[PDB]
Amino acid sequence: RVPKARNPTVTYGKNQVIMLLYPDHPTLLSYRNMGEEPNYQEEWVTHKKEIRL
Amino acid sequence: YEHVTVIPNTVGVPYKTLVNRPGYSPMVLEMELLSVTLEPTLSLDYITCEYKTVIPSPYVKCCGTAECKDKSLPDYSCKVFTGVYPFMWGGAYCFCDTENTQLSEAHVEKSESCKTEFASAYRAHTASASAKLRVLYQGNNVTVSAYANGDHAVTVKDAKFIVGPMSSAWTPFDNKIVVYKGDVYNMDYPPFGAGRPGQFGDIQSRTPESEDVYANTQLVLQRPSAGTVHVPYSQAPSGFKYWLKERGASLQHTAPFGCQIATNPVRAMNCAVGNMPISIDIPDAAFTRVVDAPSLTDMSCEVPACTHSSDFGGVAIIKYAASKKGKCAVHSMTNAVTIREAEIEVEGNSQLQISFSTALASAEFRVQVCSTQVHCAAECHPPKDHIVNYPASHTTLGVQDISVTAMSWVQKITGGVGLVVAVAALILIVVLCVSFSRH
Ligand SMILES: CCCCCCCC/C=C/CCCCCCCC(=O)OC[C@H](COP(=O)(O)OCC[N+](C)(C)C)OC(=O)CCCCCCC/C=C/CCCCCCCC
Ligand SMILES: CCCCCCCC/C=C/CCCCCCCC(=O)OC[C@H](COP(=O)(O)OCC[N+](C)(C)C)OC(=O)CCCCCCC/C=C/CCCCCCCC
């Protein structure tokens, strides 16, 4: 059994997603476009952070 | 009756089609792809695992010198060290203080964890697609599952669908695939018999039950230290355990086109590439003569609200006069506009409301409701929400179905330019004619 992270606090903007994250421990965040070029990216977040995808 | 059509390979978006057999009431079928699967054909190359170095108890020669016996084994290495003085708990083991030699030997084997913790290196070279389809035939939701190679035809409610082959041969898997448990990685593993130490494939076995293990780990024996009776050595660590730490990200998280990957067997699910030919074949007894279906006349359209959202942001209200009570099949005659309803009940002099979705900012489309057509028109307005969790239900925008009314600015400016050019050309040709006649 492995845990599930807390739901982030999402907020939208023009062609953007603003995500506020509350990790309790090193958590992996990855994202990819769903088109021809996925442009995969990832990072471990270890504290509270805000991302702009 | 045989009807052949093409729908995009997008999963979760329903598409409508018009089975128009003239002389009979039109029939509209809404079909949606619940899932599309690509299952490559796999030929196993070799299993990789964690090696286990087997060191038998060292043989010390008391008052003599031992010889290096040679035998064939995966990574056999044997060495003889002279001048050792082994010490056990109760005192020295050998009699003399010198001329004692220690015989060391070691080889490698597949660990007992081979049957559980192993990575399989494959070759993937052709894919047999499958598909699960939801088709709304005659006002009933019926779900079919069939092969999308164009060969399996599934009969549902007496009409049979034969779906595929997919228009695109694209597949997320390369020619060489390695799977570990539920993750599959696009990597070019070294061929059998050519593994390198400390890298993936240093120990290779053809099958998890074979015995001719190929192992290349540079096992080097080292001299025992200061009267100890151990067997030190210097070996490159397991390449496979190093790989497990540095795998990277599986195909499930990096494959393009939103592809989903699974195992047992390895499949790629719900790609968003290309489109899917699909052929219906309806019995001639399913249709209804045009003189028995309701016939709509005196039709007119008004479009009160119209927002070009991803979901159905438009509403059109159509006045009609119906010959008799019954169902009618509503279909949009314009590709740019998608109508959510597939059929609606109709009776008397009344009105019906259909919900449509468009990307146009000046909606102009024709809606056909049971053999009768009507023209629609509205000015759309953009939505406020910048992001949604569902894909667009409407077709993308072309450079022709473009330029809303109040693009008349383009016509006006290009007409002014054309008038100036025409006046200039007229004056030029008049002068040319007058100077050509004059001589
Ligand atoms: C101050 C006075 C101002 C007056 C105000 C009025 C101004 C009003 C106008 C603004 C201009 C309108 C521009 C808007 C364009 C809309 C964008 C569009 O609608 O486009 C979308 C597509 C994008 O593609 P996609 O990936 O979404 O589709 C493929 C889908 N998938 C990948 C699944 C296969 O774009 C395409 O495809 C287009 C393909 C062709 C692109 C080449 C364009 C060539 C046009 C040249 C124009 C010059 C005239 C020619 C001269 C001839 C002499 C008469
Ligand atoms: C003193 C005596 C003077 C007398 C006056 C004489 C002047 C008379 C006039 C000349 C004006 C003609 C100019 C040529 C324009 C013709 C094009 C046109 O007639 O339209 C064609 C269609 C109209 O649609 P429809 O409903 O008829 O067809 C659909 C029918 N249904 C709905 C039933 C399916 O439209 C289309 O298909 C799209 C057409 C292609 C559009 C290309 C993309 C637009 C790009 C624009 C870029 C310009 C940039 C401007 C900003 C620059 C900065 C300054």
Automatic annotation (TrEMBL), chain A:
UniProt superkingdom: Viruses
Coiled-coil intervals: none
Cellular localisation: Host Golgi apparatus, Host trans-Golgi network; Host cell membrane; Host cytoplasm; Host endoplasmic reticulum
Binding partners and assembly: Homodimer. Homomultimer. Interacts with host karyopherin KPNA4; this interaction allows the nuclear import of the viral capsid protein. Interacts with spike glycoprotein E2. Interacts with host IRAK1; the interaction leads to inhibition of IRAK1-dependent signaling.
Function per UniProt: Provides the signal sequence for the translocation of the precursor of protein E3/E2 to the host endoplasmic reticulum. Furin-cleaved E3 remains associated with spike glycoprotein E1 and mediates pH protection of the latter during the transport via the secretory pathway. After virion release from the host cell, the assembly protein E3 is gradually released in the extracellular space.
Name the record gives this protein: Structural polyprotein
Species this protein is from: Chikungunya virus (CHIKV)
From TrEMBL, chain B:
Presence of the UniProt keyword Hydrolase in the record: yes
Keyword Glycoprotein: yes
UniProtKB keywords: Capsid protein, Cleavage on pair of basic residues, Disulfide bond, Fusion of virus membrane with host endosomal membrane, Fusion of virus membrane with host membrane, Glycoprotein, Host cell membrane, Host cytoplasm, Host endoplasmic reticulum, Host Golgi apparatus, Host membrane, Host nucleus, Host-virus interaction, Hydrolase, Ion channel, Ion transport, Lipoprotein, Membrane, Palmitate, Protease, RNA-binding, Serine protease, T=4 icosahedral capsid protein, Transmembrane, Transmembrane helix, Transport, Viral attachment to host cell, Viral attachment to host entry receptor, Viral ion channel, Viral penetration into host cytoplasm, Virion, Virus entry into host cell
GO cellular component: host cell endoplasmic reticulum; host cell Golgi apparatus; host cell nucleus; host cell plasma membrane; T=4 icosahedral viral capsid; virion membrane
GO MF annotation: an example: serine-type endopeptidase activity
A single GO BP: symbiont entry into host cell
Disulfide bonds: C49-C114, C62-C94, C63-C96, C259-C271, C306-C380, C328-C370
Location of the protein in the cell: Host Golgi apparatus, Host trans-Golgi network; Host cell membrane; Host cytoplasm; Host endoplasmic reticulum
TM annotation in the entry: 417-437
Subunit architecture: Homodimer. Homomultimer. Interacts with host karyopherin KPNA4; this interaction allows the nuclear import of the viral capsid protein. Interacts with spike glycoprotein E2. Interacts with host IRAK1; the interaction leads to inhibition of IRAK1-dependent signaling. The precursor of protein E3/E2 and E1 form a heterodimer shortly after synthesis.
Stated role: Provides the signal sequence for the translocation of the precursor of protein E3/E2 to the host endoplasmic reticulum. Furin-cleaved E3 remains associated with spike glycoprotein E1 and mediates pH protection of the latter during the transport via the secretory pathway. After virion release from the host cell, the assembly protein E3 is gradually released in the extracellular space.
Protein name: Structural polyprotein
